[PDB]
């Protein structure tokens, strides 16, 4: 016996916020599969999935399963594992689903030591560029510390820091976090702290 699984869409699903997406799998199997389901968070997927043979004949060994995800929030993301099995073989394929979300700047405040710190979270892993406004900001500033924190809502969190004594401002420092999706820019002004 055998079960060969061919994913019609990327097993690494980068889908944007609040949008629809189909996890489609076409697989050939013999003998006929008598067990097939979509598992999510160690439990059978709560909504519905279509499931049908490619051809309703007898010489048919091709099958298709479709899972309709709708309006993905940071909550309903993760691993969607499609399971198929017959009398001879158990088979599985996993769809790691990420709601692509531009980095949100969780915090942007001044530390007790004096350093400005910007902690931003998103997916994929956001990079933080520090800028300055001598208004539009173009003066690039070198970060003295950058690291990735271990998260607990369903993404990756990075924090970056700069030397705040260096500023003779009289001005504003821009924290710009970004990734493939979008970009967030927060601003810190020393005259109002």
């Amino acid at each position, epitope marked *: 016996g055998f079960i060969n699984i061919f994913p019609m869409i990327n097993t690494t699903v980068f889908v944007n916020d609040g949008e629809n997406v189909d996890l489609i799998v*076409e697989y050939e199997a013999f003998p006929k599969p008598e067990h097939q389901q979509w598992i999510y968070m160690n439990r059978t997927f709560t909504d519905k999935w279509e499931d*049908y043979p490619k051809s309703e004949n007898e010489s048919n060994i091709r099958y*298709v399963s479709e899972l309709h995800l709708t309006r993905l929030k940071g909550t309903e993301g993760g691993t969607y594992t499609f399971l198929v099995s017959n009398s001879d073989v158990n088979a599985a394929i996993a769809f790691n689903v990420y709601v692509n979300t531009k980095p949100e700047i969780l915090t942007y405040d001044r530390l007790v030591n004096g350093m400005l710190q910007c902690v931003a979270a998103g997916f994929p892993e956001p990079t933080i560029d520090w800028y300055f406004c001598p208004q539009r900001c173009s003066a690039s500033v070198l970060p003295v510390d950058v690291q990735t924190l271990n998260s607990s809502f369903g993404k990756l969190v990075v924090q970056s820091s700069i030397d705040s004594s260096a500023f003779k401002h009289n001005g504003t420092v821009e924290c710009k976090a970004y990734n493939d999706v979008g970009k967030t820019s927060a601003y810190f002004n020393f005259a109002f702290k």
Partner: antibody
Amino acid sequence: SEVQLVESGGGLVQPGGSLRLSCAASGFNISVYMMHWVRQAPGKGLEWVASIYPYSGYTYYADSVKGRFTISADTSKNTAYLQMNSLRAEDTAVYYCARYVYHALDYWGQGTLVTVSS
Amino acid sequence: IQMTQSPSSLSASVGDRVTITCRASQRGLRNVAVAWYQQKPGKAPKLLIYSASSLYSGVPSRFSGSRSGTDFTLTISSLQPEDFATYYCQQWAVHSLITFGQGTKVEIKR
């Protein structure tokens, strides 16, 4: 980045000639969505031409364009392609590139004009 | 092969109700789903309804879809100026995949 489909490659060609349409996608990746080509003849309704899963490369065609048309996709460029060969007068239509989800087409490019005549 | 969308051309007014029907022909098909699109002159079609009755994000809730053992139906209650165009129906099936209705123009009476 917002969702956009931009068709191109349309023009005026001779019967039996060839042409290659391209659909640039942005705001989303095509490796996740099925991509379709649907044409609209002038004054007429909509006709489904072709479809592809850019990730697997699995392809599907209309009966009237097989052996002549060839849909493909480059995921590295997030772009779809429609290689139209052996063109006929009745292929004269506005060709739309569309995103496919839940058995339907949720986003449409504004199409490119293709005319086949002598 | 094929799909009959009736009727061809209609006339209504703001606050009115428009009903419009699509029929698949016929049996032997699997997992049939039907979508409804709107199209204005010179523009690309927009998805109104998918999976018979599910409304797509953006289109006002005065757009309704339904189905019976015979009919696929799109109905609009209380028209608006931006509700006047041509409306297409498409179907998807395991066999044949994508088919389209002939499209129907809603207009105005006066």
